[PDB]
Design a protein around this ligand. Sequence first.
Ligand SMILES: *[C@H]1O[C@H](CO)[C@@H](O)[C@H](O)[C@@H]1O[C@H]1O[C@H](CO)[C@@H](O)[C@H](O)[C@@H]1O
Ligand SMILES: *C(=O)/C=C\C=C\CC(C)C
Length: 17
Amino acid sequence: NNXXXXXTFXXXXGLXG
Ligand SMILES: *[C@H]1O[C@H](CO)[C@@H](O)[C@H](O)[C@@H]1O[C@H]1O[C@H](CO)[C@@H](O)[C@H](O)[C@@H]1O
Ligand SMILES: *C(=O)/C=C\C=C\CC(C)C
């Protein structure tokens, strides 16, 4: 789970994001 907020992939945390 990559992310932790917003950007290129979208918003939240989501398995290779
Ligand atoms: C994400 O958080 C909330 C979910 O209900 C809402 O305030 C908005 O949907 C918010 O979305 C933001 O991100 C998208 C791109 O991922 C933009 O299009 C929106 O304008 C907003 O900045
Ligand atoms: C979070 O992003 C951690 C691992 C992700 C692996 C990729 C997934 C198996 C498609």
